[PDB]
Amino acid sequence: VNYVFADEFDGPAGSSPNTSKWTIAKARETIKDPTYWEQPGRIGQYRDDRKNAFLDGKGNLVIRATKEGDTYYGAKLASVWEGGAGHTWEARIKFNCLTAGAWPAFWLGTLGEGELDIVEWYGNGKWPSATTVHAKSNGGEWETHNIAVDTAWHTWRTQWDANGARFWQDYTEGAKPYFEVSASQLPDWPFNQPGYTMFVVLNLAVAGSGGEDPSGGTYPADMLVDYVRVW
Ligand SMILES: [Ca+2]
């Protein structure tokens, strides 16, 4: 109805996503005490390069992982805008990047405590793909729900407020959410804090703990996003 945030990703093929709306990561996060695939020489990089994040000219954002030399590159977009409790947030996404080493995600983040991982897929061959509600930044308090991810188009929707968070895949009117978490489930539930707001993140990383080894994978690896809408 009345959207408080939206991008329909319109624009010519090969053009940049809207840089006034999205912060495109210029480097992968530096990691204290890295695991094997988080080491600086093995982890996937992020950059603001049209080879890794571009509009397709048909109304989709493409976030793309590529290999150049011995280095893999992906991309991460984070909204400048932030929204608080009581909204519904949805993206329509097609994951064509479900390959060894890849680690796509659609999530709501904060620099403070808490995170809503709406859909995450792990190319490490070890971890189930999942939707996760995190109460703490240390990753020490959460509720998670395993989901299965195919390569078809889906909508991924969350609604969250002070009292809980709910998730739907391919929402239709009256559908029961596939996963719901109430405030009572997490002692350190942060989402009821006054003024608490979250930004939208869409990203495709390579390697790190979630992706691990990209050898033998299919690159370029593509994550397509038709829109993000919040109301
Ligand atoms: Ca679109």
Known binding residue 44? Answer is no
Q: Residue 127's Cα: distance from chain center in Å? A: 16
128 closest CA partner among 140, 136, 120: 120
- Say how far apart CA 165 and CA 114 lie, in whole Å: 12
Evaluate the omega torsion of the peptide bond into residue 17 and state whether it is cis, within 30 degrees of 0. no
Known binding residue 216? Answer is no
**Amino acid (1-letter code) at residue 176:** K
- Say how far apart CA 7 and CA 175 lie, in whole Å: 25
Give the helix/strand (H/E) hosting 208: helix 208-211
Residue 137 Cα to ligand 1 midpoint, Å, equals: 32
Phi, psi (degrees; rounded to nearest 5) at 19: -75, -15
Tokens 């793309």 sit at which residue?
A: 64
Residue 30 Cα to ligand 1 midpoint, Å, equals: 33
**Amino acid (1-letter code) at residue 35:** T
Beta strands 45-46; 71-79: pairing state: parallel
Known binding residue 10? Answer is no
Token pair for 200: 């939208």
- Say how far apart CA 205 and CA 31 lie, in whole Å: 14
- Give me the resolution in angstroms, 1 decimal: 1.4
CB 12 within 8 A of CB 176: no
Torsion, Cα of 5, 168, 108, 114 (10° steps): 140
Token pair for 146: 């395993």
For 16, residues 6+ apart whose C-beta sits below 8 A from its C-beta are 24, 50, 53, 54, 55
What is the sign, positive or negative, of the torsion defined by CA atoms of 7, 9, 128, 33? negative
- Say how far apart CA 167 and CA 147 lie, in whole Å: 11
Q: Is 106 exposed, middle or buried (0-12, 13-18, 19+ CB in 10 A)?
A: buried
Tokens 């709306």 sit at which residue?
A: 21
- Structure determined by: X-ray
At the topology level, CATH places domain 1-231 in Jelly Rolls (2.60.120)
Residue 8 Cα to ligand 1 midpoint, Å, equals: 4
Residue 36 Cα to ligand 1 midpoint, Å, equals: 38
Q: HEC string of 26-50?
A: CCCCCCCCCCHHHCCCCCCEECCCC
